[PDB]
């Protein structure tokens, strides 16, 4: 219960960006994992912290690009009067 309609969720970091990328790649051979985000990322992490800043570099650029989208989305969010 932490995902309101169209509401952002804190621009992902460079690692998390590589995880969502590892996810799609893991979706190619993990029907039983289901990825409950408590057993998968643990694995991607061991697959990210290993790469070089070069690879994690373009991902740093992506997370940075998302950083701009996060601020650009607030220009249309604004919830109602709480109720």
CATH number at residue 64: 1.10.30.10
63 closest CA partner among 23, 5, 1, 21: 21
Structural domain that includes position 15:
1-83
- Burial classification of residue 60, based on how many CB atoms lie within 10 Å of its CB (0-12 exposed, 13-18 middle, 19 or more buried): middle
Is 31 marked as binding a ligand?
no
| Number of domains observed in the structure of the chain | 1
DSSP 8-state symbol, 28: T
Is 5 marked as binding a ligand?
yes
Is 7 marked as binding a ligand?
yes
Which residues lie closer than 8 Å to 6 by C-beta, 6 or more apart? 73, 76, 77
Experimental method reported for this structure? NMR
Is 27 marked as binding a ligand?
no
Neighbours of 42 (CB within 10 A): 9
CA distance 73 to 39: 30
Is 23 marked as binding a ligand?
no
CA distance 64 to 27: 25
| Overall size of the chain counted in residues | 83
């Amino acid at each position: 219960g932490k995902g309101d309609p169209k509401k952002p969720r804190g621009k992902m970091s460079s690692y998390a960006f590589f995880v969502q990328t590892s996810r799609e790649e893991h979706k190619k051979k993990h029907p039983d994992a289901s990825v409950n985000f408590s057993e998968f990322s643990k694995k991607c992490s061991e697959r990210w912290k290993t790469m070089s800043a070069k690879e994690k570099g373009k991902f740093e650029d992506m997370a940075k690009a998302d950083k701009a989208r996060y601020e650009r989305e607030m220009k249309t969010y604004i919830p109602p009067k709480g109720e």
